[PDB]
RNA sequence: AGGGUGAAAAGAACCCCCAUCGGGGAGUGAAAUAGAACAUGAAACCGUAAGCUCUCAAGCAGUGGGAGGGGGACCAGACCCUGACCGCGUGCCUGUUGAAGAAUGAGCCGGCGACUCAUAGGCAGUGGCUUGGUUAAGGGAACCCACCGGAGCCGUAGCGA
RNA sequence: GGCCAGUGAGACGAUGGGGGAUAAGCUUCAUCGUCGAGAGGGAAACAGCCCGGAUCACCAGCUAAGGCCCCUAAAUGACC
RNA sequence: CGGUAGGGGAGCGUUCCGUGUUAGGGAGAAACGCGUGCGUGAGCCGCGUUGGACGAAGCGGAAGCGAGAAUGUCGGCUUG
């Protein structure tokens, strides 16, 4: 059955898959199949890294402080630290706000003396 | 000033002089001023720490820079057991802020 | 690309050849004609008349002196091939192809800017 | 009286619409 | 197997290199980055040039975080292109209770290639009419397949051999 | 009740019984759950075991199972 | 609001035709890039370059309606 002639139609269905493939190391950007198995990866992993992006930092923040705990005095855990604020009443200074360690370590030094007084 | 406001579920340490792509602010129109008295941390010399939720005095002031979904990230997924390829674009007005007043 | 002269449908190849032009690249019009006449490769022709083809003409056709000439661009490309057939065993594992070449080089003056300066008190 | 703005808006048939679903 | 340079070919004198094959100029034409492989001429494939990464680093190698470098920014406001390194991480499809594979099909690309059509019947949506509804052949001064034709079929009473 | 289906060689774990030596992710039935037609977290890596069962974004918090010397976040915390 | 086979409910695009010698085009289709804005998506719109001719907005109608695998078919082109 003489189709309606794919012509340019089936031409756009492949090049569009190539435009997306313009930053890959391997030859997964110069073939519909090599990219077919490539896009799916960036089609599944993408659906993951999007939710993993939050977890990826969940360990970071804790690690950021962890490296800052092995110097002060509370060699115990940063948990007791969080416990102090919890039992206290500070809904601030979150895992993200833990950036006070690196820059201006003078502010993060105050809470260090406020956690001991509470507990 | 080290301020910790609330976007509804997010609490960044938005340092004065930088913008933050907040969520949707139906209460605030384009090029409108917004105030969040829900700030927790405060600069002023030593990092002050209030007791009861949020702060009782002072607040944050700034002006939104128009709302828009910026760039359609277009999230998606995939399955092996069965060919299931679908694409969906997420809007998110990512309303940016501003602020400038900085302090220790 | 000032002057580009050569040809096509050469009886040479694309693999064995080219390896000769990759040595004359970035070389003057002389340093290239003093090496080809020593290259025991067939590719030396008609590539020999090539370096001479790109030159000479660019001397009376355009304003380019014999000197300061250097091979700017040079590359060998495969043209049209012929599908030949050669018996061997029931005739099956055959295709045959004659990788022809039609290189196209170009010559042009050289930049460079020297201006030595010294002081001589007397 | 037609508005000289290149774009008439009379009222003929244009389309016979659809006829049921499915 | 193999289609068309252009409107008319004026389809290329002469000049230069070569073995008086081939090419480049000079000219013709609105075009020859249209000239006899010639129209528009993508992809697979095959190269040059430029920026970045690249010898102590390994596993379908992308992705998330992410320094530096070559450029482009705004009379800071920390962004647009490449990417060291790092956390995870065993193609697709088919067939199966179950595989990434030692399960199988596929070298790549362009084109091409698999539930359409006729008649009839039973439903669903919708439309005209209505216990009525509706024709088939045929005729037709037919801008026209209308009109006429209701021969015939279906339904409102059934049940029983 | 009516229109269109699909599928009839499924597997595994717990529990209650026939086959085998109460030997097998072996085979043949009943019941529940999972895989098979739902990822992910945990058991190093093991679909079927455990927790929980994914509209989506988010440098947002708290938990389940499983853990907390380092390697991948988390007690070489206290008492016997 | 995970989802296979399946069932049901909504649309895009392609060739052609009716509504079109109306309108857009030599101050110019087609082929490639880009604006990475827009829609749930397949895509659409605008535009630069190249290039050479027509093509076609909207609704509906009629389709031989878009495949990277059936040891496919034809042609061209890699690798050993």
What does the block give as tokens for B27? 């209460």
DSSP 3-state of B51? coil
State the virtual CA torsion across A87, A89, A95, A99 in degrees, nearest 10. -120
Strand F contacting residues by CB (7 Å):
A 47, 50-51, 53-54, 57-59, 61-63, 66, 75-79, 82, 94-96; B 9-12, 23, 73, 75, 77, 79, 81-82, 88, 90, 92
Question: Got the DSSP string for A34-56?
Answer: HHHHHHTHHHHHHHHHHHHHHHH
Classify strands B75-77 and B86-88 as parallel, antiparallel or unpaired: antiparallel
Resolution stated for this PDB structure, in Å:
9.4
SS3 sequence of chain C: CCECCCCCCCCCCCCCCCCCHHHHCCCECCCCCCCHHHCCCCCHHHHHHHHHHHCCHHHHCCCCCCCCCEEEECCCCECCCCCCCCCCCCCCCCCCCCCCECCCCEEECCCCCCCCCCCCCC
d(Cα C48, Cα C85) in Å, to the nearest integer?
33
The experimental technique used to determine this model is: cryo-EM
B75 and A91 within 8 Å at the Cβ level: the answer is: no
Identify whether the C-beta of residue C55 lies closer than 8 Å to the C-beta of residue C29.
yes
Contact C59, C29 (CB under 8 A): no
Q: Which long-range contacts (CB under 8 A, 24 or more apart) does B7-10 make?
A: none
The whole-angstrom separation of Cα C58 and Cα C52 is 10
Which two structure tokens, joined as six digits, stand for B18?
């930088």
Q: B32 to chain A, minimum CA–CA distance in Å?
A: 27
Residue A54 CA to residue B9 CA, distance in Å, equals 14
| Contact check, Cβ <8 Å, A97/B76 | no
Q: How far apart are CA A85 and CA A79, in angstroms?
A: 10
User: Which one of A40, A91, A112, A115 would you mutate to disrupt binding with B, by most B Cβ within 10 Å of its Cβ?
Assistant: A91
* CA distance to B85, C20, C50, per residue, from C106 (Å): 51, 16, 10
Give the tokens for residue A66: 């962890």
């Amino acid at each position: 059955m003489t189709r309606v002639k794919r012509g340019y139609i089936a031409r756009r269905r492949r090049k569009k898959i190539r435009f997306f493939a313009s930053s890959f190391r391997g030859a997964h950007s110069r073939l519909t199949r090599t990219i077919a198995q490539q896009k799916i990866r960036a089609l599944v992993s993408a659906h993951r890294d999007r939710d993993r992006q939050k977890r990826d930092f969940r360990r970071l923040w804790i690690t950021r402080i962890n490296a800052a705990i092995r110097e002060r005095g509370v060699y115990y855990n940063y948990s007791k630290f969080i416990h102090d604020l919890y039992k206290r009443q500070l809904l601030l200074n979150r895992k993200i706000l833990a950036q006070i360690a690196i820059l201006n370590p003078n502010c993060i030094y105050m809470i260090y003396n406020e956690i001991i007084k509470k507990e | 000033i080290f301020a910790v406001v609330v976007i509804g579920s997010r609490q960044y340490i938005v340092i004065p002089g930088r913008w933050i792509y907040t969520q949707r602010l139906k209460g605030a129109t384009v090029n409108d001023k917004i105030v969040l008295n829900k700030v927790l941390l405060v600069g002023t010399k030593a990092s002050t720490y209030i007791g009861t939720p949020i702060v009782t005095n002072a607040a944050v002031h700034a002006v939104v820079e128009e709302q828009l979904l910026d760039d359609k990230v277009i999230v998606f997924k995939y399955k092996k057991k069965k060919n299931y390829r679908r694409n969906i674009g997420h809007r998110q007005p990512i309303t940016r802020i501003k602020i400038t007043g900085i302090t220790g | 690309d000032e002057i580009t002269t050569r040809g096509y449908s050469i009886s040479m190849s694309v693999d064995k050849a080219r390896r000769v032009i990759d040595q004359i690249r970035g070389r003057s019009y002389a340093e290239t004609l003093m090496i080809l006449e020593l290259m025991p490769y067939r590719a030396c022709y008609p590539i020999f008349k090539l370096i001479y083809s790109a030159a000479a003409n660019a001397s009376h056709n355009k304003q380019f002196n014999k000197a300061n000439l250097i091979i700017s661009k040079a590359e060998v490309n495969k043209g049209i091939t012929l599908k030949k057939v050669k018996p061997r065993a029931r005739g099956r594992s055959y295709m045959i192809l004659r990788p022809t070449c039609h290189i196209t080089i170009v010559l042009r003056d050289i930049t460079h800017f020297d201006s030595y300066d010294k002081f001589l008190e007397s | 009286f037609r508005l000289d703005n290149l774009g008439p808006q009379p009222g003929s048939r244009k389309r016979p619409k659809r006829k049921g679903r499915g």
